[PDB]
């Protein structure tokens, strides 16, 4: 195999070394949302190859501790106070950066920030600030597969509107649209397990009919690298679905099987009932702080996004265009994390 | 040539070189006894193009290289034995480097070609190896010569060669081109 | 080429910064391959960076014809490459791939073209064939005319004669000192 | 050139008493356990020439020198500058091993070591140094010889003038 | 301008028009002064300090320079020629940078 350059202008001058931690890569990156699940792996991929990553974070030293190990001396720059509404800080963050990745998103609404702020206002404002600079060459935005303007869920609708705004201001931006991402710190399998084990009943929207294409975090992280190593990818949206399309019922059953749960704890909370149970609780969320007890699963938006098929459109760009073979998320290393919990020879 | 005549032990290597070999006959021991001193009695500058050799001939650092002044110590340098392309003599030299930088160039013994002497141009032209350097492929556009990758430059050369045919293609080799 | 001069449409400069201005027809496509930016690079549509004598292991022949070789004292700078590798890569791009793909194979090709290149470090004697050559070129030497020029050196200033020397600051100071 | 007449005596004697068993070229390199791509590197077997600054003959191949003077050196590879502190960074594992520790008394010893490990090598013999003064200044007496300006012409003598 | 100027020496411990021994540090960054390479501020440089100190008159044609007042707490002992030296063109201690000049050679 032959190392492929990061297709950035004047990279040939600055780049030097084998491509490792101590080598010099000509990529300075401002990854918004670095401390998140998706952002941390992107930071790891970029910094692993000797590049410098600027990580704006909302003040939290313990949350951004893993990012410190990611790179060599002076390569991972952690900016302490990030606000989505502060223009001057955003300009300072992307001052030296030639690529900007936006992974900032909220699964649920709160009193301080709504979907329309984070998923619409921040992309537009950041798009204008990046456009005025000109030094930034590549822009990557991470969105859900099911995001559509004509979507019942407010999260997936606002995300698509923000993506359209980004496309308007920067025409050469690439919209990465992965599916439900499986990982050790993921919110897919971990939430499903917590539902199966520490919840009285596991409500399943409809009968698990909704189809999904889960993908492993390393595959999306590698896909980001392949986007940055090709300039021909610019201006295109890539639907990074997984190798296998599975219904939600199959994933629940297979989690029950791998964990060797005694029996099936899942119940049928059909739609038109969740739309009445969670509808007031959304208004409850918008007027109260972040609470661990209820979140993500316990929302009308989640029920609305679990009544549709979040699958890649037939004619679409994907992993094949990036020359990546996605790994199965129901077998192999991907499933080791749930495997450690219980496999029936365990405890 | 930098001078520290206080460090001068009164050997006559510089005078003998300037007379017998260089043949400019500029340096001599003026004085008698302890206050005897070496150098031009008048203010004169050494004119030979073999002037650098007195620095190597000087055993006690009284004559030193002004370009290579206070820049490095001997133990810090890695020496590689190569040849000088300054002229067709092919003087045998030893290039001393610290890291990625050439720090100094000194001759080597080859009685066949350069006994142990080096011309000033070859000795002190390493300075111009750090300046006006080409680092990246450049392809011309309306905005001028601009950064390009190796593939793009080769593509432009391919489109250019396609037009030309036979003796329309012409090659001019330079002074420093090698056999390969 | 000598019999029927053809206006060049593409000119390849292999480190040639001293070309006569009439050499390039001023509408030609110029490819400059070299390591300093000088008169050659300024007049280039494509510039291909190459290594210098300090950065490459290359063969040079003396005025006595002794074949001597350089070593890589310092690593190559930026996105520059060894010159023979550049030409072979361009040969693959243009559709005429060259047989050699390694430095020893290039040296073997040099040995085939001229056997003495295999004898690195040794000067090979020449058979005295000069008289037969001049007997061969009888008509041409008669064709040659007389010029109103006197036998003299072409080196105006010794310190600057090539691109490396012209870039050197030290050589410029030496030249200014001589010209004052 | 006479004899060191020290521990080197027993050193040489241990050399001549003992010997090594012959093996096929490159077989030991597999026993070494190092990455096999190490032996893809090319080897130059040379003796350093004398530094022009100093007039000592110890480092040269001279009868005075009693130390190993033939080095195995590997070709130079890429080097860069640390972005933070400008330090010289490298990825070459064999950067300084050959210069620092691979010292041999004779060219055949280094060639045997290289062939035993499987390294391809090119041996470069030092340019011969012959301590022969030129005929003009062959001796101290030649400095004040009649060669400088010829035999003194005696046409200036008063007898010859008159 | 500094990009195409020849490195030169002011001449306090050197001559007015000599070459300056220079390494290639700062050549990429674009710095061509000694102090710029290592000091990034706008404060007073040590060269500015040493220039402010004035030459000192001494008697004789040689002065012993120990750098500091106590011989064992400063530079090695140095003997500097005071011949052909004046206030405008003083002799310099290479270790310390102190400047000296004497009128004795003029038979005074």
């Amino acid at each position: 195999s032959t190392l492929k350059p990061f297709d950035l202008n004047a990279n040939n001058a600055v780049r030097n070394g084998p491509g490792g931690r101590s080598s010099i890569g000509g990529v300075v990156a401002t990854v918004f949302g670095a401390n998140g699940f998706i952002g941390s792996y992107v930071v790891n991929e970029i910094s692993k190859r000797g590049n410098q990553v600027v990580c704006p974070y909302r003040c939290n030293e313990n949350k951004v501790q893993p990012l410190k190990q990611m790179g060599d001396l002076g390569q991972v720059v952690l900016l302490p106070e990030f606000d989505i509404h502060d223009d001057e800080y955003i300009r300072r963050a992307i001052s030296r950066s030639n690529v900007v990745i936006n992974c900032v998103g909220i699964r649920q609404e709160t009193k301080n920030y709504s979907y329309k702020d984070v998923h619409v206002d921040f992309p537009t404002r950041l798009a204008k600030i990046v456009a005025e600079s000109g030094k930034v060459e590549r822009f990557i935005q991470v969105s859900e597969m099911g995001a559509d303007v004509s979507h019942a869920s407010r999260r997936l609708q606002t995300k698509a509107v923000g993506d359209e705004a980004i496309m308007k201001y920067i025409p050469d931006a690439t919209i990465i649209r992965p599916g439900n991402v499986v990982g050790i710190e993921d919110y897919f399998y971990n939430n499903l397990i917590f539902q199966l084990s520490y919840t009285i009943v596991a409500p399943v929207i409809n009968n698990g009919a909704n189809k999904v294409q889960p993908t492993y975090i390393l595959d999306v992280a590698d896909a980001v690298v392949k986007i940055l190593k090709d300039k021909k990818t610019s201006g295109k949206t890539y639907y990074l679905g997984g190798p296998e399309t599975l219904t939600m019922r199959q994933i629940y059953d297979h989690l029950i099987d791998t964990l060797r749960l005694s029996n099936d704890d899942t119940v049928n909370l059909r739609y038109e009932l969740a739309k009445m149970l969670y509808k007031p609780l959304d208004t409850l969320r918008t007027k109260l702080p972040e609470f661990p007890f209820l979140g993500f699963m316990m929302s009308s938006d989640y029920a609305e996004e679990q009544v549709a098929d979040s699958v890649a459109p037939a004619g679409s760009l994907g992993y094949k265009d990036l020359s990546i073979s996605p790994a199965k998320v129901t077998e192999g290393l991907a499933i080791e994390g749930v495997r450690f919990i219980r496999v029936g020879g365990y405890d | 040539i930098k001078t520290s005549m206080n460090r001068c032990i009164h050997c006559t290597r510089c005078v003998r070189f300037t007379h017998e070999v260089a043949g400019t006959s500029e340096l001599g021991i003026t004085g008698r006894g302890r206050d005897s001193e070496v150098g031009t009695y008048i203010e004169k500058l050494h004119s030979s193009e073999l002037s650098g050799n007195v620095i190597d001939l000087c055993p006690v650092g009284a004559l030193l290289s002004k370009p290579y002044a206070f820049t490095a110590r001997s133990w810090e340098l890695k020496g590689t034995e190569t040849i000088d392309v300054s002229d067709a003599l092919g003087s045998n030299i030893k290039v001393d480097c610290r890291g990625t930088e050439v720090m100094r160039i000194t001759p080597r013994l080859n009685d066949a070609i350069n006994e142990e002497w080096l011309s000033d141009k070859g000795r002190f032209q390493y300075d111009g190896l750090k300046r006006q350097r080409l680092n990246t492929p450049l392809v011309k556009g309306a905005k001028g010569l601009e950064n390009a990758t190796w593939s793009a430059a080769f593509d432009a050369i391919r489109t250019a060669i396609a037009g030309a045919k036979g003796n329309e293609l012409k090659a001019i080799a330079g002074k420093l081109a090698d056999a390969e | 080429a000598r019999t029927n001069p053809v206006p060049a449409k593409v000119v390849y400069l292999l480190g040639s910064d001293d070309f006569k201005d009439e050499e390039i027809p001023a509408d030609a496509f110029v490819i400059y391959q070299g390591h300093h930016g000088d008169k050659g690079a300024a007049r280039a549509n494509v510039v291909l960076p190459g290594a210098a004598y300090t950065e490459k292991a290359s063969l040079f022949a003396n005025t006595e014809g002794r074949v001597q070789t350089t070593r890589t004292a310092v690593p190559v700078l930026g996105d520059a490459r060894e010159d023979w590798k550049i030409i072979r890569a361009l040969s693959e791009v243009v559709g005429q791939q060259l047989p050699y793909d390694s430095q020893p194979q290039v040296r073997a090709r040099l040995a085939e073209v001229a056997p003495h290149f295999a004898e690195i470090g040794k000067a090979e004697s020449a058979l005295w064939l000069n008289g037969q050559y001049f007997k061969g070129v009888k008509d041409l030497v008669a064709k040659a005319a007389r010029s109103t020029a006197s036998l003299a050196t072409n080196i105006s200033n010794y310190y600057m004669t090539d691109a490396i020397s012209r870039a050197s600051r030290t050589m410029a100071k030496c030249t200014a000192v001589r010209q004052q | 050139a006479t004899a060191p007449q020290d521990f080197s005596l027993a050193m040489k004697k241990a050399d001549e008493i003992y010997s090594g068993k012959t093996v096929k070229a490159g077989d030991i390199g597999f026993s070494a356990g190092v990455p096999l791509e190490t032996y893809n590197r090319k080897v130059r077997i040379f003796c350093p020439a004398k530094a022009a600054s100093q007039s000592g003959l110890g480092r040269t191949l001279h009868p005075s020198s009693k130390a190993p003077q033939w080095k195995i050196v590997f070709e130079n590879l890429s080097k860069w500058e640390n972005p933070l502190m400008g330090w010289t960074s490298t990825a070459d594992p064999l950067e300084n091993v050959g210069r620092s520790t691979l010292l041999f008394y004779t060219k055949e010893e280094a060639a045997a070591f290289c062939a035993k490990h499987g390294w391809e090598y090119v041996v470069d013999e030092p340019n011969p140094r012959k301590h022969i003064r030129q005929k003009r200044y062959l001796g101290y007496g030649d400095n004040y010889s009649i060669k400088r300006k010829g035999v003194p012409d005696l046409a200036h003598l008063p007898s010859n003038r008159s | 301008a500094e990009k195409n100027k020849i490195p030169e020496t002011v001449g306090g411990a050197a001559f007015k028009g000599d070459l300056r021994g220079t390494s290639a540090v700062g050549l990429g960054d674009g710095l061509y002064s000694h102090t710029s390479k290592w000091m990034q501020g706008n404060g007073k440089s040590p060269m500015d300090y040493i220039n402010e100190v004035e030459p000192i008159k001494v008697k004789g044609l040689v002065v012993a320079s120990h750098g500091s007042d106590d011989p064992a707490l400063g530079c090695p002992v140095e003997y500097i020629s005071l011949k052909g030296t004046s206030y405008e063109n003083p002799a310099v201690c290479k270790y310390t940078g102190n400047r000296y000049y004497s009128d004795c050679w003029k038979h005074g």
Partner: peptide, 28 residues
């Protein structure tokens, strides 16, 4: 957050410790 190396992102004039000057192509 007072002292950082001169090659740091925080440094006002960040330093690339390159020891070679690069030719600048002529305009147009």
């Amino acid at each position: 957050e007072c002292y950082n190396p001169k090659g740091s992102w925080f440094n006002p004039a960040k330093r690339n410790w390159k020891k070679v000057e690069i030719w600048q192509p002529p305009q147009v």
